[PDB]
Design a protein around this nucleic acid. Structure first.
Lengths: 249, 97, 735, 716
RNA sequence: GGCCUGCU
RNA sequence: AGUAGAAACAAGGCC
């Protein structure tokens, strides 16, 4: 109901009507990236400079109807002045902390299921067992190794169709996945995330990260396993070796 | 080319009846007078309001022939009556009430 | 006793303590005003290194151009751009012979990419010179403006959605009598053929800031949008070629560079017997970009693309053809001050052609006098050579050809050489039975380099025995030695957001521990200092302290409200649980089991009004410009929390005549959000097609209402309401 | 033939078919019979779908015209007439909502009763072959297929015909209308067989017009056209052309190697001129501290109250008077500013609660001291052209200045120990791995070594001052603000303490660019008389403000106590980089830990404890008139920390240039000392490159002097 | 005096 | 004055 209604409201005004009519689907990306905002050259300097202002961050308009304009002593939490090239409003950082102490609460039980990679890292490290540190010269030789320890033996494009069919089943188009490994992955990640309401985009991004294999060139000495490379900073050094066995093994 | 032959018409009394037919070697009847325009009679059943209940259009599909029954004719129905189909028209016949 | 750190080198070798010689703890030099002086100096220097060439006047642009190719051979060691066509063609032929099938294959993959590439690939670029407004703007904005102008002028082949079609339209625009542009102060202005040619062939010049390692500032250039597609295709070909060359090091990272350097030094020295001596030259090329003539790149590519479809050759040749006629905008201008009347003034650079020379000092006066003959419509012709490393990969190809030309099969002498080339820098390992052989080999290498328009900087180069050398701030001494002073500037808060900054800092510490041999205790100290700076920057202190800030009240009440305070994030005033073992874990997941369910739910709430995600590309990618290197992007692990807000924008557009761009931004974003709600996959996979917005949106409204009734909330009343509302918007689009 | 589609069919269908024509990219002028055939297919699709509605039952309601109501459901909903992307969108949506099977090709319609697809195709050939043809094209299909053909016959599997027969009579009447209308037209010479499935195209990228002429002007000097040059390139083969030009090229083009021996390198020449002055934003060696011995932590507390309490701890105030003038400014303004600061400090002391941040009055005194309303007003060139004085901004090499001995002593005392701990580090996760324990022990050793160091005190001073200045500039852009220089330490006894060096008055700070300058005036207490090294205080104004009595065995000194007052400035970049001075600790201690690890790779054991306690090994860390002096590892730590701190304090382009061009020569000298037969092509050029970076910066000149001393001691 | 902006 | 260094800041524009 609503969606077509703001569609009609947009088409009511002449300029947006022209934009909707003359613009083709292919140009979607271009106009979406059409912005006057330059990409910052020195982000640290301005982040240290903007945070000294009042209302340094930006938030959706809806914040004006969930968080009061001021806190107990009267420190303002949000302003009604919109951003430069968006309908979002500039708000103070307190509106963040406020949201974490009296804002609406939900059931975050499914975030562990979504962010599978990070929670698997945490579980692997929690059950790890350290050993003695041995001091001897390490011959670090540079090798190509896979960093992602949960890659399902799929490439970027190869798993992209799987991700769409898992999250966006209707926009798949011609592709119907042939490999049965992809079939089982789709089934599992479909039944697992059937009602998760985090965001389609973040779900797709994390599925891409988990399933897609990624490789990088690093100086290693021993190890060479996927689980042993994520902790390469902790097990191998310039003149010391720290024996380690992740919780998985 | 497919063409239509009107039959029927002639001079007829006020309150009297006529039978028109149209043979074809959606289908219709139409009429026209001096002083006005090409005037809608009937389609096949759909009619114009001025003509309802008085005139009954019907067809045969077997011998390719449509029929207009006109009952309770009035002076204002004096016209040339034409048939047509869906693009083509007949030559028309004159009905004088 | 007087303390002197440098004396420490008397006991510790120079490379083992080279980090001490990198003052990367202070503010790097910045430029303050116009870069016009540097642009003029660079143009004059590029034109006078090729003075002995031949002059001509282009019949299209009417600008004077200098061709030094096949010019007189140099008779001095000064920089020279007199490259010889036959010599470079022979070098490329030998490169092909030593690597058969390189050019044909690379051309095949490049042909595939060119004929399947899309227009949107041009949006994935940093600032570009929009000619519609004569100023630098984001790549997407400039592309959109150029497409709009083309469509308004009648060039609508780009509607096919293909980059090749966009380039076809671009070339067709060159043969138009009169184009039309828009200006706000809206006014429609007409550009004739020559003016549009110069606007499409021109470059925008700026001054490079944050450049560490030299006393003087330099100038850099940014091209337009008409020429970026050809550049993209040419660089794709060059990258595909260099990926097949082990002597190149430009298309790889740092660790790969080190590995290849070690391999080449071991190969050269190990194969050398006791009788052969080995010497390493740590060479830098003076005026690398100013001495590379685009015509020679045209020759190299046309030799590479031999026996290929003529359309491929044409599309790959268009780029150097435009660079050979490239023009450069002088710059921002010049600012004058009058102390007697106590005022200041800013004259644009376009007045340099006619403005009197009474206001300029002797140096600038002479520079303007020398560059004036080349001024055409406020821009100077820069045919002789490249401006700033636009063809990095082709230059690397030429250098690799030079390196391979001494494989001992072409030297025809006892001496021989090899090494690694990365544009403007090289390491050359030369072996020969005696010092005379080494001298002859280096002399011939230098001479051959001078025949290709490449000069070796004698002041910044030195030769020693193999085993010790330098390459792009990587010091090799019987094995590469860590520096850690190049990455020091990256140890602070990045400046993206709270969660992003935390993750980026911990990940940078981890990486520099893995690669740059950062010590454990040093890493712990870095973690402590980073946490301190992070808390002091975001006003998020431990919460149990009495440090009054603008955010210390809400943080303190959250602290007193929470029961398990060990689960609070550092952003919310909680303790830091990070350590050397936890540097690869996001903060949210490390504290997940310690958070109270109420705070956990409030933090990671999808309905939060702060989190905003635009595209799959910008989810967890942060662009950090590294010190002493080109802009780079990093993947940082982070969980989407309420702290993932995006900061405020500039907001200074409101005082400029270009104020309508914000309204267009808002309307485009509203339409894009509506489309995304209609097409959820709009962000992850960019939609493709040739239909218009409203068609897809209305038709999908039809179908989705239908099916969501066939099972879902909709009802007949609502379904029919949607159907007739779709009809209403249909008839509205009719009129 | 196109005249037929001009005449008969309605607009809607003709433009739908035209967009379907554009879909796959073939042109309509070459073959139009496909257009007519597929538009008739689309027409039968409509005429079969429309006029067919359903209500809550099955048994479709058929109405010749949809009446106004919610009962406008369509019996058959069309697939084709849409783009491929949307056709597959509808296919997938139907499959996911109907739970049916996804076909591999494009259907034409969907129906509810039987909950499935219809692929309508009316071909010229008779049905009973085309049906099974398209059937074997589609794999294992449950979608029912139904086709007509011009003769008037119908067929389907299951003997199934899904709706009314009068509609099918409609279809075949339409069909024979088409047929015996082409009869009037006469198209069957090709109508039955006009499409054979042609798909081929050649990509054409032709250079022509102006862009061709440009190609003719981008060739070597003796070429006339791109065609000729490409022909020459294709016909070119290597025939020893590099050798010919190498032989013909002049022999003066050479890269002769000049041997580098012990007697080759000469000392770097230093510039001569007036002595070098002080550039720091605060006093480093001559600072004085007023303290309270409070238990508050670094950030804990309120600045103004702490400053006032510290200042009340000192007795002996005198009416201030000029001792050493600025020599270029108006010292009475500095005097009046100091008295104003004192008066307003008392004014705060009187009132109820000390404000967290105070704003000062904008008197003419600080208007001059902060440089207010001195920027020339910006105007247009067309209005100021006849002014003779109008010229460029002064752009020349900075003034030349010779090194002085004060920077050496300042660095010497910047590496000395202190009676306080100036670093209070944060918390870290409790160490769980043995390597973490080793790291923590190492870190504790270095903290014990460097905390009691003047370099750490300077780090904290700079960080706090720059943080406060940046925050005040960003918050109070317009109005002058008072900020007391505060630094909190911990005594040997363990009691925490605060220290007040002085005050900073920040001025207007409307900073837009990263290079825009915010001016402030800094006042700092000290005891060092400025009458002994005046050249070091060229830009300072120094007053006499009191007398101090520090307990000494010589009765009690009762020394004078002066106030160094000056006008200084910074910028956003400088403030940001000065507030990250803590990474000097990193740099230094990373270097020391690299030393320790490198040495411990030799002996298979951690070597930190004996390095820090036994102090047997020592490194050359300075030279005394007797000779080179070596110190323990802790002294090396402090020396490197001081070097990094001074790099961060006296940063400048000169420093970067000298560092690079002297690291080059250092590497060459190291190669010489390693017996690696180093050689150079132009050493004079390198020397000139190094010597051009030494202009007036005290730090870079001191570094150059150190480099000369290192060369003198090396090369032996 | 009143109001706008701080990478456009 | 001061910062800074091959050109700039020491507020800008709009009424």
């Amino acid at each position: 109901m609503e969606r077509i209604k703001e569609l009609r409201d947009l088409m009511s005004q002449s300029r947006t009507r022209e934009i909707l009519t003359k613009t083709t689907v292919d140009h979607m990306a271009i106009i979406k990236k059409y912005t006057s905002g330059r990409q910052e050259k020195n982000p640290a300097l301005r982040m240290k400079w903007m945070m000294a202002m009042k209302y340094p961050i930006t938030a959706d308009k809806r914040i004006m109807e969930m968080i009061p304009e001021r806190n107990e002593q009267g420190q303002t939490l949000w302003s009604k002045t919109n951003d430069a090239g968006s309908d979002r409003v500039m708000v103070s950082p307190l509106a963040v902390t406020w949201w974490n102490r009296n804002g609406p609460t939900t059931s975050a039980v499914h975030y562990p299921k979504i962010y599978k990679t990070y929670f698997e890292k945490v579980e692997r490290l929690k059950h790890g067992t350290f050993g003695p540190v041995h001091f001897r010269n390490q011959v670090k030789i540079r090798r190509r190794v896979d960093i992602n320890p949960g890659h399902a033996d799929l490439s970027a494009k190869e798993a992209q169709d799987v991700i769409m069919e898992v999250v966006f089943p209707n926009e798949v188009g011609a592709r119907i996945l042939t490999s049965e490994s992809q079939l089982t992955i789709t089934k599992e990640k479909k039944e697992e995330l059937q009602d998760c309401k985090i965001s389609p985009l973040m779900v797709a991004y994390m599925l891409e990260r988990e399933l897609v294999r990624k490789t990088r060139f690093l100086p290693v000495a021993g190890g060479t396993s996927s689980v042993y490379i994520e902790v390469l900073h902790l097990t191998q050094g310039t003149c010391w070796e720290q024996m380690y066995t992740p919780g998985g093994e | 080319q497919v063409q239509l032959q009107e039959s029927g018409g002639g001079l007829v009394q006020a309150g009297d009846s006529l039978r028109l037919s149209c043979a074809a070697s959606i289908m219709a009847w139409f009429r026209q007078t001096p002083g006005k325009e090409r005037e809608l009679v009937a389609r096949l059943q759909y009619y114009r309001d001025s003509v309802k209940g008085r005139f009954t259009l019907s067809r045969d599909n077997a011998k390719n022939t449509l029929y207009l029954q006109m009952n309770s004719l009035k002076p204002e129905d004096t016209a040339v009556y034409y048939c047509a189909f869906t693009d083509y028209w007949g030559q028309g016949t004159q009905v004088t009430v | 006793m007087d303390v002197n750190p440098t004396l420490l080198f008397l006991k510790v070798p120079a490379q083992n303590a080279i980090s001490t010689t990198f003052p990367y703890t202070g503010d790097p030099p910045y430029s303050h005003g116009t870069g016009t002086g540097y642009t003029m100096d660079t143009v004059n220097r590029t034109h006078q290194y090729s003075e002995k060439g031949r002059w001509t006047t282009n019949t299209e642009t009417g600008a004077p151009q200098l061709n030094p190719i096949d010019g007189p051979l140099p008779e001095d060691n000064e920089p020279s751009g007199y490259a010889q066509t036959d010599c470079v063609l022979e070098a490329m032929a030998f490169l092909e012979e030593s690597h058969p099938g390189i050019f044909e294959n690379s051309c095949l993959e490049t042909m595939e990419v060119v004929q399947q590439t899309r227009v949107d690939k041009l949006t994935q670029g940093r600032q570009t010179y929009d000619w519609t407004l004569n100023r630098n703007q984001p790549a997407a904005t400039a592309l959109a403006n150029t497409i709009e102008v083309f469509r308004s002028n009648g060039l609508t082949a780009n509607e096919s959605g293909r980059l090749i079609d966009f380039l076809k339209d671009v070339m067709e625009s060159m043969d138009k009598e009169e184009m039309e542009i828009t200006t706000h102060f809206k006014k429609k202005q007409r550009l004739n053929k020559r003016s549009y040619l110069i606007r499409a062939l021109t470059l925008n010049t700026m001054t490079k800031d944050a450049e560490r390692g030299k006393l003087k500032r330099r100038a850099i250039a940014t091209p337009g949008m008409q020429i970026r597609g050809f550049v993209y295709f040419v660089e794709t070909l060059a990258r595909s070629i260099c990926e097949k060359l082990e002597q190149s090091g430009l298309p790889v990272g740092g660790n790969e560079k080190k590995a290849k350097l070690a391999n080449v030094v071991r190969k050269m020295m190990t194969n050398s017997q006791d009788t052969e001596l080995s010497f390493t030259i740590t060479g830098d090329n003076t005026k690398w970009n100013e001495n590379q003539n685009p015509r020679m790149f045209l020759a190299m590519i046309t030799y590479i693309t031999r026996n290929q479809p003529e359309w491929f050759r044409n599309v790959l040749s268009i780029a150097p053809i435009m660079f050979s006629n490239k023009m450069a905008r002088l710059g921002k201008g010049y600012m004058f001050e009058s102390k007697s009347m106590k005022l200041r003034t800013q004259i644009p650079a376009e007045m340099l052609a006619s403005i009197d020379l009474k206001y300029f000092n002797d140096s600038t006066r002479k520079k303007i006098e020398k560059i004036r003959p080349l001024l055409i419509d406020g821009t100077a012709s820069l045919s002789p050579g490249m401006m700033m490393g636009m063809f990095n990969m082709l230059s690397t190809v030429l250098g690799v050809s030079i390196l391979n030309l001494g494989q001992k099969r072409y030297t025809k002498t006892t001496y021989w050489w090899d090494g690694l080339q990365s544009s403007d820098d090289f390491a050359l390992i030369v072996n020969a039975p005696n010092h005379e052989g080494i001298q002859a080999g280096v002399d011939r290498f230098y001479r051959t380099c001078k025949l290709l328009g490449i000069n070796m900087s004698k002041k910044k180069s030195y030769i020693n025995r193999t085993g010790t050398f330098e390459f792009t701030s990587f010091f090799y001494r019987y094995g590469f030695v860590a520096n850690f002073s190049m990455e020091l500037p990256s140890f602070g808060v990045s400046g993206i957001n709270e969660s992003a900054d935390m993750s980026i800092g911990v990940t940078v510490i981890k990486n520099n521990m893995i690669n740059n041999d950062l010590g454990p205790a040093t890493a712990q100290m870095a973690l402590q200092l980073f946490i301190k700076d992070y808390r002091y920057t975001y006003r998020c202190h431990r919460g149990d302290t009495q440090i009054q800030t603008r955010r210390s009240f809400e943080i303190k009440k959250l602290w007193e409200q929470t029961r398990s305070k060990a689960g609070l994030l550092v952003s919310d005033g909680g303790p830091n649980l990070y350590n050397i073992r936890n540097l690869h874990i996001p903060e949210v997941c490390l504290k997940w089991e310690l958070m109270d369910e109420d705070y956990q739910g409030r933090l990671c709430n999808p309905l939060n009004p702060f989190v905003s995600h635009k595209e799959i590309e910008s989810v967890n990618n942060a662009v950090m410009m590294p010190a002493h290197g080109p802009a780079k992007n990093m993947e940082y692990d982070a969980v989407a929390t309420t702290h993932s807000w995006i900061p405020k924008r500039n907001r200074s557009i409101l005082n400029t005549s270009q104020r309508g761009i914000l309204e267009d931004e808002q309307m485009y974003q509203k339409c894009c959000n509506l489309f995304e709600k209609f097409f959820p996959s709009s962000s992850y996979r960019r939609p493709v097609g040739i239909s218009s917005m409203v068609e897809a949106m209305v038709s999908r409204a039809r179908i989705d209402a239908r099916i969501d009734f066939e099972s879902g909330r909709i009802k007949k009343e609502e379904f029919a309401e949607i159907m007739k509302i779709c009809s209403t918007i249909e008839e509205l689009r009719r009129q | 033939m196109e005249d037929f589609v001009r005449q008969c069919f309605n607009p809607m269908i003709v433009e739908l078919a035209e967009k379907a024509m554009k879909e796959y990219g073939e042109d309509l002028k070459i073959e139009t019979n496909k257009f007519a055939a597929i538009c008739t297919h689309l027409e039968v699709c409509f005429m079969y779908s429309d006029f067919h509605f359903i209500n809550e039952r099955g048994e479709s309601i058929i109405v010749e015209s949809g009446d106004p109501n919610a009962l406008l459901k369509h019996r058959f909903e069309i697939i084709e007439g849409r783009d491929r992307t949307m056709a597959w969108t509808v296919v997938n949506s139907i499959c996911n909502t109907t739970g049916a099977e996804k076909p591999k090709f494009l259907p034409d319609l969907y129906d509810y009763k039987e909950n499935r697809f219809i692929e309508i195709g009316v071909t010229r050939r008779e049905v009973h072959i085309y049906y099974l043809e398209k059937a074997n094209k589609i794999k294992s299909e449950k979608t029912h297929i139904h086709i007509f053909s011009f003769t008037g016959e119908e067929m389907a599997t299951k003997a199934d015909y899904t709706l009314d027969e009068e509609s099918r009579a409609r279809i075949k009447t339409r069909l024979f209308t088409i047929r015996q209308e082409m009869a009037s037209r006469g198209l069957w010479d090709s109508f039955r067989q006009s499409e054979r499935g042609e798909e081929t195209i050649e990509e054409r990228f032709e250079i022509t017009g102006t862009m061709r002429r440009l190609a003719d002007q981008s060739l070597p000097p003796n070429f006339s056209s791109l065609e000729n040059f490409r022909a020459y390139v294709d016909g070119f083969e290597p025939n020893g052309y590099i050798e010919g030009k190498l032989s013909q090229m002049s022999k003066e083009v050479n890269a002769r190697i000049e041997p580098f021996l012990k007697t080759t390198p000469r000392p770097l020449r230093l510039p001569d001129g007036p002595p070098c002055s002080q550039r720091s934003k605060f006093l480093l060696m001559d600072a004085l501290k007023l303290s309270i011995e409070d238990p508050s932590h670094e950030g804990e507390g309120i600045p103004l109250y702490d400053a006032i309490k510290c200042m009340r701890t000192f007795f002996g105030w005198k009416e201030p008077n000029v001792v050493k003038p600025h020599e270029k400014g108006i010292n009475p303004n500095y005097l009046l500013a100091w008295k104003q600061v004192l008066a307003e400090l008392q004014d705060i002391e009187n009132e109820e609660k000390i404000p967290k941040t105070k704003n000062m009055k904008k008197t003419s005194q600080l208007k001059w001291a902060l440089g207010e309303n001195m920027a020339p007003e910006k105007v247009d060139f067309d209005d100021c052209k006849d002014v003779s004085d109008l010229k460029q901004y002064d752009s020349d090499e900075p003034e030349l200045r010779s090194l002085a001995s004060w920077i050496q002593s300042e660095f010497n005392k910047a590496c000395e120990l202190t009676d306080s701990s100036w670093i209070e580090l944060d918390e870290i996760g409790e160490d769980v791995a043995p390597i973490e324990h080793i790291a923590s022990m190492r870190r504790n050793y270095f903290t014990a070594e460097v905390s009691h160091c003047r370099a750490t005190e300077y780090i904290m001073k700079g960080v706090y001052i720059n943080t406060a200045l940046l925050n005040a500039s960003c918050a109070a852009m317009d109005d002058f603000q008072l900020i007391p220089m505060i630094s909190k330490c911990r005594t040997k006894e363990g009691r925490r303490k605060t220290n007040l060096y002085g005050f900073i008055i920040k001025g207007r700070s409307h900073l837009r660019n990263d290079t825009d300058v915010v001016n402030f005036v800094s006042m700092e207490f000290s005891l060092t008389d400025p009458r002994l090294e005046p050249h070091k205080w060229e830009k300072y104004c120094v007053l006499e403000i009191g007398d101090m009595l520090l307990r000494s065995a010589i009765g009690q000194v009762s020394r004078p106590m002066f106030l160094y007052v000056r006008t200084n400035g910074t910028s956003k970049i400088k403030m940001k980089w000065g507030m990250e001075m803590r990474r000097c600790l990193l740099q230094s201690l990373q270097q020391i830990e690299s030393m320790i690890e490198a040495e411990s790779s030799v002996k298979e054991k951690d070597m930190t404890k004996e390095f820090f306690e036994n102090k047997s090994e020592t490194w050359p860390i300075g030279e005394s008139p007797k000779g080179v002096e070596e110190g323990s590892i802790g002294k090396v730590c402090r020396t490197l920390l001081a070097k990094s701190v001074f790099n961060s304090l006296y940063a400048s382009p000169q420093l970067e240039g000298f560092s690079a061009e002297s690291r080059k020569l250092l590497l060459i000298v190291q190669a010489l000392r390693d017996n690696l037969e180093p050689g150079t092509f132009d050493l004079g050029g390198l020397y000139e490159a190094i010597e051009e970076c030494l202009i007036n910066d005290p730090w870079v000149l001191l570094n150059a002097s150190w480099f000369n001393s290192f060369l003198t001691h090396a090369l032996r």
